[PDB]
Every structure is written in C-alpha cells, then in structure tokens.
RNA sequence: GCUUGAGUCUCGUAGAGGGGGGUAGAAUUCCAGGUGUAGCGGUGAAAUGCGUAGAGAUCUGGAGGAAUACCGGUGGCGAAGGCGGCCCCCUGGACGAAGACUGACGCUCAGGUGCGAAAGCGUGGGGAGCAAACAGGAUUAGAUACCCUGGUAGUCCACGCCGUAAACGAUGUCGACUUGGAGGUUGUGCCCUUGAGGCGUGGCUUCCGGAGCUAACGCGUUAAGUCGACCGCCUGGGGAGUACGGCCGCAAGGUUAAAACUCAAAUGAAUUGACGGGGGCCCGCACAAGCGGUGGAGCAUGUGGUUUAAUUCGAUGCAACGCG
RNA sequence: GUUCCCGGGCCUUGUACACACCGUAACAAGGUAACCGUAGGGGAACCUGCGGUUGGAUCACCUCCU
C-alpha cells in the first residue's frame, strides 16, 4: 500500500522436518484457525502421496512441487491506454504462494474421502503431472506466451 | 533519401529520411493553405524558445536548494 | 581530482563553474564545498581517508 | 512472369490507408496489397499493424514472379513508412536499397483541406 | 551677414519594394497506350460518387491554370496598405567615410488631391484546386449547421466605378533631450581584416529594467518619460457610427452624421474562491494476490405500503432499516 | 508498485462568473478559439471564402542518438 518494500515475516517451522515449504502449506490448508487439527492431516497425507509416488516424505514434496510452480504471473501494468497483460516474472517467495494455494483448492474439491486422502490424491497427481492442481499451473503458463511481444 | 549499406544492417535504416524532413513538408502541403497561421504559432513558439534560455539564466545565478 | 575534496580547478575557479571570478575567495559551491583559492596551492593540497 | 528480379514496391501511405503497389522499373505492375483491402475498417487502417498485414499481402502475389533484391520506393509518410519496410525485411527480402523518392512540390497548386 | 536645422552632388551596398513581358521544374484534374486488382475515398461512424463501359495505383509524351517546400531569421523594403523562384530594362526610398555652399529655403491642417488588402459588378478571355445559393446520405425530435462527393459566383490577366476595415506595435507627425545587457539585420572609418575581432556612428525590430508617468498591467532611446509647433475626437450606455437630404454610383451603397424616450449604470486592469471528461505528487484495504458473507435457506429485529376499532410519532442517499 | 478505480489536499492554468457551471454561436482549447472589414444566403443564431491581429490554450507524454 504505497510504501511497503517489506518481504516475508516469520512462521513456526514444522515439528518433524526442517522444511518450511511444508510449514506454509499447513497454515494455508487449515481453516477456522485450527492448525493442530490441520497439521496432523498433512502428515497422514504426505505419507500416502510419498507412498504412492516412489520416494521420501520430503523430496516427494519438492519434486512434486516443481510440477505445480509457475515462473510467470501476468499483471495489469500499462504504459499507454490499450488493455494488455504483461508477462511478469514473479519473486521466488510468491511462486510457492501460487502452488500451495491451488493444491489447497484441490483438497476442498473432488469428493473422494478424508482430507488427508483427497490431498494425497491431488499431489500424487501432481507427482505424475495430472489432476486439477497441476492443471491450473499449465493454464497460467499459457497466459504468458500469448502476451510475449509487449516488453 | 537513399539508404543502402551492402551488408551490416539486419535493419531498414530510414534515419536520414526522418533526419531530412519526413513530416516536415507533409504537415505543410497536406491541408488548406491559410497563409497567416504559421506566423502566429511561431509567435508563441519563439517566446517559449527564449523562455528556456530564460530558464538557463534562471539556473545560473541561484538555485541554492 | 576534486574541488570539494581538494580545490579550485583554476585560480578561484569552481568545479561546476559557479565561480569564474578571480575575486571570489572563501565562498564555497553550496552544492559541494569548493572554497575558492589559487589552484597552484593544489601542489600542497593534503587530504585523507 | 515478366522475368523480373527488381520488384519495385511503391509503398504509399496516405492518412487512413496503406496502398502498396509492386511494379517493374518500366512500370509493368504486378499487383497490390492494402491495409483496407484486408479488412480493419476504421481507425484500424490507421495502424501500422494493418500496414504489417499489408506488407504481407504484398509479400505474396510475387511467388509467381520472383523478386529478390527489391527496391523500396517510399512516398506518403502516413500510417505506414515504419512497420511496412520493416515487414518486408522480415518477410524474407534482401532489399538492395530502401528509397525515399519524394518529388515534393513547391506547393504550386492548392492542396485539399482537413481537420478544422 | 554667420552656422549646429532642411537639402543635393562626387564615391558605394543590400533588398517577399513596385511595374510590363518571357521562361525552368515538381504536383494535381484529365487524354492515349502496355501491366493489373476489387476495392478507392472518408469520418467518431455511415453514406453520395466511381467500378468487367475496367476507377485508385505505375512509367513515357503533353495542353490550360494558379502558386513558389527546403535557403526562412518577435528578419528585410515602405508614408501606409501590402508583398517570398530566375532574367532583361526602368526606378523610388533609406544609410555612410571626407569635402564644397545658398544660408532656417522648416513643420502641419477644414475645402482639395492621391494609394487603397479582399470583395461586388461591367467587358475581351478563363475554370486544375478550393468553394456562397443548392442537391444526396447522416449526427438529430429538425437542417437550409461541424463532415464527404459534385457544382454557378469569385479567385487570375488588362481598363474603371461605390471608395471600405481590428487600414491595430490600438501608441498621429517633424525634432531635441534621458545609467545598460542578450541580440538580430545592413553598411562604414581606424589598428597587422595575422584570425573566427576590439573602439565609435545611423535606419528597423524584440525581451528584462532605472529615471518618470500610471488605475494597474507595464511602455521604457522604436515610449504610455520631458517640451514646442499642427489637426481630428469625447462629455454615461443604447438609439447609431443608422434612416433621409447635398455630392457620387449601371448594381451592392459610401461620406458628412442626429433626435424623442428610457435606464442609473456601461467599461478596463487586477486577485481569492466555485467548477473542469486540464497537468504533477501524495494518503486510506481504493486496487492488485487471497479469506469469510448479504442476495438462494432458517431464526430474531425494523421501516414503507396495506388493513384495521387502533395497528403512535420521528428519521426516510452515503450519516434511516438489532435506531429511539 | 502508483501506471487502473472512488473520495481528499497542496501547487498551477483559465473565466464578460461572484445572485459564484426554437438553438449552444462566445466565457476551460466550451470538445469548432475570438473580433473587425466585404459579398451573398437561410425561420434565425451564425456559416462559407479572402485579408489582419492577439482583446487566445498545452507545449505535458510515448519510441530513438550522447
């Protein structure tokens, strides 16, 4: 808001792994403020996705994160008067603020079973490039190349 | 007028055409004559042409900002 | 090679040229301190770091 | 046809129209292309993008003739004059030389009139 | 009688200064011929028109017609108006170094005379472009109005008539006097024009200022500062810078130039607000990226309307509707 | 991040306004700048052509060379 050049604040790291990528995903997957109730679910989800993927509970999350993390977010920043989108290379901190946002929007759609299992599906789908999670990431990337003449 | 350059271009290079007149005589032989017009607008133009030099004289003596 | 750090490029001559007066002595360029004195004394201008 | 290599593309951009007329040095025309004959009716003909489409409609209708070292004789510094000569140098043409052959009048006769 | 006033000659320069005629070149309308396409043109948009009877577009040859991009400079000439290729002849006005003289021969005005952009018209020719009256399509409730395509008058060459203006740097004219700077334009004298200059003098013109004037803005050696000489104009606005009459005109009118009545102001300079689909910067979750809702559903509450024996009154854009 | 959008402030430009923003021709550039002179025309304002002047407005942005 007109002055902020401030970055990101502090969050409590995960009580298991030294990954705070995972630590941000829990605060976004929770609802009605209940983080304890939400964190135990991420655990029962991260296990079965890694169990259906082929590797460990940490790389089966980072390697499954590259398939759902864009590089571009196009924003409305005009120079003249016409209406066009400008391909904006986004900061690395917001890139995750794109991935672990749709994966959550995935855990709230697809009426499968428990939350830990529907999530275990959508990121396992991302681990094999499929599903609604990885799907929206594809769509944003398509929003970039069609507007890459305006520089 | 005529730009050529045998090989190092990878560009059209019409910079002397614009450096000639281009719109110079376009703006003068495209619409109605009206003989007096330029005279008046060169009037406001000339006074503002001396004004920047008046700004050159306005920056040399003080500006203790 | 500075007038603010050392002195006048020429005798009573400011860096920017705000003082092309060989009468001006002492008065500095208010942008950056250019105390106008003889440029020949710049064979004795001692500075530091 | 014509056995021509010197495709003289007379690019004339009036105000709201980019009419390019490829011919020969003798005058034997090959055909034309226009920012208005391709569509874009309105302030759209006024855009060099239509003049770009123009240089492309002019980039064709010559694949039966064979212009290679072409001459770009420009007149009419209106809508074209920019993304038109550049479109030819982007359409696969080796322009021997871009010419601005403007036999400007000394304003002998009286011209029309516009915006009042 | 004598000279600082007026004036001319010897010796020179520059110029959209005027005048008669002739000529060069491009562009445009159009004509003939070869090529060739289905669009050109125009506007915020549409449309009249042209088009297989081949337009627009390209090259060559060419006849009318008017006008000179770039050199172009709040620059030059002139009483003013006004006026931009070149050449031949004619020629007015302005200015200067060094001398020669009559010796104030100087200034201006009612009646009077001359110039007079552009336009109206008469006459021998003309019509490319633009374009009064007018026609078609639209903006529109309407168009005789912004726009486009056509088009009579006019525009041009030569002779005249009515003899008019913001004919306005609004500054009447001859002249003398009054600290400077940036300059521009055109000559000249002196010193080695070694050199892109230094020191003075006249014409025209622009900006900032002192003296002084002034309501103020500002003018400021070209004055609105200081005087003398000559003429015209004003007595609040409107009526009206008009009718009619003298004089003049083929036509359109022109010059000199009022009254009755009514109103109690007309006008100018200079400032702060109101508003701006004018410019710049900044602030608030205004927006960008996300989370939860009203509206579809349930409960409680409220207002208008309706009805009733009565269903108090008030607020009733944001700031009324769990408010009293 | 201030270039989009709603409201606000400061500086600034402009006004025949201060009683304070049948047809729009002037006052913001009134989205067509104004007035004088002349001929003609239309219910009518005024408009079209020609000559002049300032009693007119911004010279702020978007692409290129040091």
Author numbering:
A (entry chain J): 1 to 151
B (entry chain X): 4 to 68
C (entry chain 04): 57 to 105
D (entry chain N): 12 to 127
Question: What do the authors say?
Answer:
Coupling is thought to involve direct interactions between RNA polymerase (RNAP) and the translational machinery to allow cellular co-localization for efficient translation initiation and to prevent RNAP from backtracking during transcription elongation. We find that RNAP binds the 30S subunit with high affinity and report cryo-EM structures of the 30S•RNAP complex. Strong density shows RNAP docked near the mRNA-binding site of the 30S subunit between the head and platform domains.
Maximum likelihood classification reveals conformational rearrangements of RNAP adopting two conformations on the 30S subunit. The two states are related to each other by ~7° rotation around an axis positioned near the Zn-finger motif. The rotation widens the nucleic-acid-binding cleft of RNAP, as the β and β’ subunits move apart by at least 3 Å. The N-terminal Zn-finger domain of the β′ subunit interacts extensively with ribosomal proteins S2 and S21 and with hairpin-loop 40 (h40) of 16S rRNA. The second binding site between RNAP and 30S is formed by hydrophobic packing of the β-subunit flap helix (β-flap) residues Leu901, Leu902, Ile905, and Phe906 onto S18 residues Phe10, Phe13, Val40, and Ile44. Elongated density connects the β′ subunit of RNAP to the Shine-Dalgarno binding site at the 3′ tail of 16S rRNA. We were able to model oligonucleotide-binding (OB) domains 2 and 3 of S1 into this density, consistent with studies showing that S1 domain 2 interacts with the 30S subunit and with our crosslinking experiments showing that aa 272 of S1 domain 3 is in close proximity to aa 420 of RNAP β-subunit. Remarkably, the RNA exit tunnel of RNAP lies next to the Shine-Dalgarno binding site on the 30S subunit. The 30S subunit is stabilized in an open conformation, with proteins S7 (head) and S11 (platform) separated by ~15 Å, allowing access to the mRNA path from the E to A site.
